[PDB]
Symmetry: C2
Subunit: 43 residues, 2 copies
Protein backbone atom coordinates (compact mmCIF):
# COMPACT_ATOMS: atom_id res chain seq x y z
CA UNK A 1 0.00 0.00 0.00
CA UNK A 2 1.12 3.60 -0.37
CA UNK A 3 -1.51 6.32 -0.20
CA UNK A 4 -4.13 5.81 2.49
CA UNK A 5 -1.35 5.54 5.05
CA UNK A 6 0.45 8.81 4.35
CA UNK A 7 -2.97 10.45 4.31
CA UNK A 8 -3.99 9.10 7.69
CA UNK A 9 -0.70 10.61 8.83
CA UNK A 10 -1.45 14.12 7.61
CA UNK A 11 -4.73 13.80 9.46
CA UNK A 12 -3.03 12.77 12.68
CA UNK A 13 -0.93 15.88 12.18
CA UNK A 14 -3.83 18.33 12.05
CA UNK A 15 -5.34 16.58 15.05
CA UNK A 16 -2.22 16.77 17.20
CA UNK A 17 -1.93 20.41 16.19
CA UNK A 18 -5.40 21.60 17.17
CA UNK A 19 -4.75 19.70 20.38
CA UNK A 20 -1.73 21.81 21.27
CA UNK A 21 -3.92 24.78 20.38
CA UNK A 22 -6.81 24.29 22.80
CA UNK A 23 -4.11 23.15 25.21
CA UNK A 24 -2.29 26.47 25.32
CA UNK A 25 -5.62 28.26 25.48
CA UNK A 26 -6.69 26.36 28.58
CA UNK A 27 -3.23 27.03 29.96
CA UNK A 28 -3.80 30.77 29.66
CA UNK A 29 -7.25 30.66 31.24
CA UNK A 30 -5.76 28.51 33.99
CA UNK A 31 -2.90 30.78 34.99
CA UNK A 32 -5.22 33.77 34.79
CA UNK A 33 -8.01 32.06 36.70
CA UNK A 34 -5.38 31.16 39.28
CA UNK A 35 -4.11 34.67 39.95
CA UNK A 36 -7.70 35.89 40.00
CA UNK A 37 -8.86 33.10 42.29
CA UNK A 38 -6.19 34.13 44.78
CA UNK A 39 -7.42 37.71 44.63
CA UNK A 40 -10.89 36.42 45.43
CA UNK A 41 -9.56 34.52 48.43
CA UNK A 42 -10.42 37.09 51.08
CA UNK A 43 -13.79 36.45 52.70
CA UNK B 1 -2.75 -4.35 3.87
CA UNK B 2 -4.70 -4.90 7.08
CA UNK B 3 -3.05 -3.93 10.36
CA UNK B 4 -1.19 -0.63 10.26
CA UNK B 5 -4.36 1.05 9.01
CA UNK B 6 -6.73 -0.03 11.77
CA UNK B 7 -4.01 0.94 14.23
CA UNK B 8 -3.57 4.43 12.83
CA UNK B 9 -7.33 4.65 13.32
CA UNK B 10 -7.29 3.79 17.01
CA UNK B 11 -4.64 6.48 17.35
CA UNK B 12 -6.77 9.07 15.59
CA UNK B 13 -9.44 8.09 18.09
CA UNK B 14 -7.40 8.84 21.20
CA UNK B 15 -6.30 12.10 19.59
CA UNK B 16 -9.80 13.29 18.74
CA UNK B 17 -10.82 12.37 22.28
CA UNK B 18 -8.19 14.31 24.19
CA UNK B 19 -9.05 17.16 21.84
CA UNK B 20 -12.66 17.23 23.02
CA UNK B 21 -11.25 17.07 26.54
CA UNK B 22 -9.08 20.18 26.56
CA UNK B 23 -11.89 21.71 24.51
CA UNK B 24 -14.52 21.41 27.22
CA UNK B 25 -11.97 22.55 29.79
CA UNK B 26 -11.27 25.76 27.90
CA UNK B 27 -15.02 26.14 27.52
CA UNK B 28 -15.43 26.13 31.29
CA UNK B 29 -12.62 28.60 31.90
CA UNK B 30 -14.12 30.76 29.17
CA UNK B 31 -17.67 30.99 30.50
CA UNK B 32 -16.29 31.53 33.99
CA UNK B 33 -13.73 34.10 32.87
CA UNK B 34 -16.59 35.81 31.06
CA UNK B 35 -18.90 36.20 34.04
CA UNK B 36 -15.93 37.30 36.12
CA UNK B 37 -14.68 39.74 33.50
CA UNK B 38 -18.08 41.40 33.54
CA UNK B 39 -17.90 41.71 37.31
CA UNK B 40 -14.53 43.41 36.88
CA UNK B 41 -16.02 45.86 34.40
CA UNK B 42 -16.63 48.73 36.81
CA UNK B 43 -13.75 51.20 36.89
Amino acid sequence: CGGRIARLEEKVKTLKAQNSELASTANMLREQVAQLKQKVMNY
